[PDB]
Short mmCIF file of C-alpha atoms in Angstrom, two decimals:
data_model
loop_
_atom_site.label_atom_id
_atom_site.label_comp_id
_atom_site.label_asym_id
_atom_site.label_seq_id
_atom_site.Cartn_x
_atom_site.Cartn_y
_atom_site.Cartn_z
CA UNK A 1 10.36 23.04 -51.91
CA UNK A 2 12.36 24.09 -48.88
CA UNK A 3 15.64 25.25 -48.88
CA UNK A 4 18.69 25.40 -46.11
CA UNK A 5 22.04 26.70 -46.37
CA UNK A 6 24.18 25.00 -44.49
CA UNK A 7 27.80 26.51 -45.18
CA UNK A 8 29.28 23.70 -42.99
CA UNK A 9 32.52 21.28 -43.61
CA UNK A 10 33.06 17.82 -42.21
CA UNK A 11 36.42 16.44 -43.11
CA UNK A 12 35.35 12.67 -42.11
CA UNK A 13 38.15 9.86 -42.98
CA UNK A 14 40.31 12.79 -45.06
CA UNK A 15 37.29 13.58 -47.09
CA UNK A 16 36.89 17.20 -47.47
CA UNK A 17 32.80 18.08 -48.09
CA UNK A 18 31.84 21.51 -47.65
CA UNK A 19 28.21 21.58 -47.62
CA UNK A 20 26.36 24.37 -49.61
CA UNK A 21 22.46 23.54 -49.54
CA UNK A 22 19.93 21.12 -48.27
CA UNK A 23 16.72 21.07 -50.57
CA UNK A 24 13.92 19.29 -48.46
CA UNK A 25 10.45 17.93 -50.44
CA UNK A 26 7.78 16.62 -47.80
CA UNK A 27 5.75 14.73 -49.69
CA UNK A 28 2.52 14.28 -46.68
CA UNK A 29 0.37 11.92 -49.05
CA UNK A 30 2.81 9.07 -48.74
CA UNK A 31 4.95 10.26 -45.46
CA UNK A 32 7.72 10.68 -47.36
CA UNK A 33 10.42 13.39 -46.62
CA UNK A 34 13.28 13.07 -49.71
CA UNK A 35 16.40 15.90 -48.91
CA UNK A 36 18.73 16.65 -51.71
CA UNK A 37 22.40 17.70 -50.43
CA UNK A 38 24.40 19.76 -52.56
CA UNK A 39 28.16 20.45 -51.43
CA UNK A 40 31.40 21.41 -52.76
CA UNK A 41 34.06 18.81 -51.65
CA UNK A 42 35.08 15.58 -52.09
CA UNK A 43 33.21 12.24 -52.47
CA UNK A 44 30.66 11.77 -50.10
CA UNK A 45 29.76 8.80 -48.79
CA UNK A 46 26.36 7.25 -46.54
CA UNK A 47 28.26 8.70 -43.47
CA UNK A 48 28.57 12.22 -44.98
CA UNK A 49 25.10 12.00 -46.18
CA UNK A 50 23.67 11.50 -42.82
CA UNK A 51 25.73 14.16 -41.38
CA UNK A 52 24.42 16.91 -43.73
CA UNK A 53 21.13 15.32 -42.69
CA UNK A 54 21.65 15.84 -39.05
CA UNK A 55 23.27 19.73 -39.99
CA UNK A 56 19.80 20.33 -42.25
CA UNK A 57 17.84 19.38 -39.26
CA UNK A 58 19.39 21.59 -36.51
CA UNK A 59 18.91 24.35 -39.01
CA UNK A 60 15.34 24.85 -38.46
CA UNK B 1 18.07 0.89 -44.47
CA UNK B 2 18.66 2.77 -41.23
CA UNK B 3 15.67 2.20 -39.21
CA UNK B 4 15.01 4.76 -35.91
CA UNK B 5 12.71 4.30 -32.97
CA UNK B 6 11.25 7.51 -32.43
CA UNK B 7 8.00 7.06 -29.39
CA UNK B 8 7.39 10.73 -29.39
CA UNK B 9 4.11 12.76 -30.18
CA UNK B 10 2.84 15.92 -31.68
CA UNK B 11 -0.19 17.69 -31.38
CA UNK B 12 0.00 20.80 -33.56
CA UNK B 13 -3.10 22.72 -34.53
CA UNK B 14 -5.19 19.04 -32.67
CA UNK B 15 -4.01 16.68 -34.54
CA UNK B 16 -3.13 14.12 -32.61
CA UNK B 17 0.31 12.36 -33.94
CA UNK B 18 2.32 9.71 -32.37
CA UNK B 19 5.42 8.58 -33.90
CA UNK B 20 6.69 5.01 -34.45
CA UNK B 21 9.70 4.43 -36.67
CA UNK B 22 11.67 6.17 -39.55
CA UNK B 23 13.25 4.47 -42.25
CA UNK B 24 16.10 6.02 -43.55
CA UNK B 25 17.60 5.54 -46.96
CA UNK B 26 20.89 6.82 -48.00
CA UNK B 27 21.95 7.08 -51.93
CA UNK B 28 25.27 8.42 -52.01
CA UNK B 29 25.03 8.48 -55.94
CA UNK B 30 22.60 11.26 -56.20
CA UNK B 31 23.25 13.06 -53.07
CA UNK B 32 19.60 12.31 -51.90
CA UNK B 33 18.41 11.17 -48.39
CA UNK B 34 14.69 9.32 -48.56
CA UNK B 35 12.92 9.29 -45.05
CA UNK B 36 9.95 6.71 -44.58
CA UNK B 37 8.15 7.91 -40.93
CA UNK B 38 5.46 5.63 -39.67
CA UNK B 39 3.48 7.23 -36.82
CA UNK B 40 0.20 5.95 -35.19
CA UNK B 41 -2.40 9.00 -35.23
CA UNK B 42 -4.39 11.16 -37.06
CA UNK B 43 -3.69 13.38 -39.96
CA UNK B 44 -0.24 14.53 -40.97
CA UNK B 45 0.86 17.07 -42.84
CA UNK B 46 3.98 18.66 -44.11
CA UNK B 47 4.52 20.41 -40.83
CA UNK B 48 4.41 17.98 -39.04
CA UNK B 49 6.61 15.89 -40.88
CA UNK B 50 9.22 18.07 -40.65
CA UNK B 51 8.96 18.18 -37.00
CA UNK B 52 9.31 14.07 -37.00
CA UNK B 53 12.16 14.66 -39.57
CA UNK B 54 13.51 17.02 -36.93
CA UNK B 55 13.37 14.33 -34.13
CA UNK B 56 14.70 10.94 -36.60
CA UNK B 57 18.15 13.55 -37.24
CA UNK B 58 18.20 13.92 -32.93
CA UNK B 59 18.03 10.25 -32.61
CA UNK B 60 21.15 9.65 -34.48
#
């Protein structure tokens, strides 16, 4: 269980989502990776989601 | 169902790894990001797949 802070915001279409933490399971046996985004902000959306999962990315 | 051409390789620790594709999928609901990665080449493992989950978020 891997875990990135991201302490980032993205304010995309007026929606305010400050990200918090990025909890990555690799799963090798089925090449699976499955990331779990928590943030304090508004609603997120696929667009947000995807964002957070570029940010989680560049973190390590 | 985001789908990503990725054409890159990896050969950590001889393992020989060449990417093909990563299928993305988004839930919004439970603030989760699922990442299928296809690659042609020998054995993965979670290191690796974080490397090819660090080259699908560079792609986009």
């Amino acid at each position: 269980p891997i875990v990135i802070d991201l302490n980032k915001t993205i304010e995309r279409d007026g929606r305010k989502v400050k990200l918090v933490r990025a909890t990555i399971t690799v799963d090798p046996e089925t090449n699976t990776i499955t990331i779990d985004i928590e943030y304090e902000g508004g609603p997120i959306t696929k667009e947000d989601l995807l964002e957070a999962f570029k940010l989680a990315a560049s973190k390590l």
